[PDB]
Amino acid sequence: MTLELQLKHYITNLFNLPRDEKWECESIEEVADDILPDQYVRLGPLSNKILQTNTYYSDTLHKSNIYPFILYYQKQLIAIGFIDENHDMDFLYLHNTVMPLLDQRYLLTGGQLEHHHHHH
Secondary structure, three states: OOHHHHHHHHHHHHHOOOOOOOOEEEEEEEEHHHHOOOOOOOOOOOOOOEEEEEEEEOHHHHHOOOEEEEEEOOOOEEEEEEEOOOOOEEEEEEOOOOOOOOOOHHHHHOOOOOOOOOOO
16 A cells, blocks of 8 residues: 555556566655746745655666656655656645645546446
8 A cells, every 4th residue: 555656556557667677766855846847836835845856767767758756755745746758747646745735546546537427
């Protein structure tokens, strides 16, 4: 039920990349504003805050040009996201220090393409 495990499975399932391939974790201190867009850090408390970001890089991730990372502060998950080839920012779990803004479990595990009706 680990959040990091779901993130690895979610990313691998998204591009259908080998799940038996382990990546290399890199621990470095980065500013939320430098990484996350100003749209989510226009004036938020994460302004000039140094959050520990764990970026993972492997042969599959490097080949697909995908840079996945997890943001946490004081041993606490703050937000999760990865950058695809389209440079588009994909957020699977957003949780600010004060209160969370966006948090959808379906997106995190990848909701179906339709769930409005099924009883039929």
